Amino acid sequence: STGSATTTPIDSLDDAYITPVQIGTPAQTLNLDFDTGSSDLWVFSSETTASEVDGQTIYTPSKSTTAKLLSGATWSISYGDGSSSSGDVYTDTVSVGGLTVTGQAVESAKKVSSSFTEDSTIDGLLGLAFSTLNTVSPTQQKTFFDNAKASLDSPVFTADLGYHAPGTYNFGFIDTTAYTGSITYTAVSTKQGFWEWTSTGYAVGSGTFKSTSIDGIADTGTTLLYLPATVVSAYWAQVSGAKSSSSVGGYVFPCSATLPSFTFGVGSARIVIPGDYIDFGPISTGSSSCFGGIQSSAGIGINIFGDVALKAAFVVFNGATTPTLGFASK
Ligand SMILES: C[C@H](NC(=O)CCC(=O)c1cccs1)c1cccnc1
């Protein structure tokens, strides 16, 4: 089997991407944030504290003839940005782009933190990291991909995120029309439960490539590119007036600037992130200070190849017995 679904930016800055997902019988369609950095499929629901719901579409398990309470199961997750959610668990039928998994754990939120409430466009998360990170207790549950994998034509999914435009998540096949040149594959460590890999280096604009190993995660659920402070300083040094602002919480730059590109290495191959991809717009409405799309990972503890990086590539998440990651230009 295969599936193919369009993923759409939630706003004009590509702050995140949402993908429609069918849950239950009859189908209830929710727009979920596909997140290769976590492993819980959780949704706003009829059980979510009323004051914490503000415009989201909810899953109502009592209206699904295929929903079953997973008795005694609870979940609770906290992400790197300090956001969180928790609740109980149902199993139900879940379909993405024509690919159906029966008995998928659908984690129903009883509580969500303020940033989730405040984002009316995201109805939940669909985790695509390794199932070892799943938070359901006392019986850990599998991700949608982990459940689908054996049925797929090939045990892979691909992320093809757009810049200020829709893109595609495919399951079970590689669309050879969706990228240019060849796909370069690189090793993955699953030891921390992430799609963790090692970039071979970077360049800023038309500058020379610096060969250096940068270990990080391929994370569709993080907006920006978070890299070591040395690398980030080398980038922003090429932008007149750019500076790290403790009050704003990262590098800002004059909105009048033309940003240089940023290149990262995948083996001997190179992925080029155009300068425009690194502009996240005014820090507040009407400001001439703009927020940067490349930020230091120093406070985080891991480097993160988030959407800013991934959207410059066609990315293969290869779930073979020994997982790997593939990157192509597009
Ligand atoms: C934006 C956030 N990203 C992460 O949590 C990346 C992961 C991260 O920071 C860390 C991993 C290990 C130590 S720190 C997010 C929010 C909501 C849903 N998904 C992701």
What does this structure look like?
With 330 residues, the chain is mainly β. It folds into two domains: 170 residues, Acid Proteases (Cathepsin D, subunit A, domain 1, Beta Barrel); 156 residues, Acid Proteases (Cathepsin D, subunit A, domain 1, Beta Barrel). 7% of the residues lie in helices and 44% in strands. It is built from four helices and 24 strands. Strand 17 and strand 18 form a beta hairpin. It starts with a strand and ends with a strand. Ligand 479 binds next to loops.
Keywords:
330 residues; mainly beta; Cathepsin D, subunit A, domain 1; six-stranded mixed barrel; globular; binds ligand 479; disulfide bond; signal; Endothiapepsin; aspartic-type endopeptidase activity
The major pleated sheet works out as:
7 strands, mixed
Give the total of beta strands.
24
Question: β content, as a range?
Answer: 35-45%
Bound molecules: the ligand C[C@H](NC(=O)CCC(=O)c1cccs1)c1cccnc1
Instruction: Examine the coordinates and then state which fold CATH places here, giving the name of the CATH topology of the largest domain.
Output: Cathepsin D, subunit A, domain 1
PDB class: hydrolase
Keywords: Fragment screening, hydrolase, inhibition
Assembly: monomeric
Entry title: Endothiapepsin in complex with fragment 162
Question: What is shown here, in short?
Answer:
The chain has 330 residues and is mainly beta. The protein has four helices and 24 strands. The chain has two domains: 5-174, Cathepsin D, subunit A, domain 1 (Beta Barrel); 175-330, Acid Proteases (Cathepsin D, subunit A, domain 1, Beta Barrel).
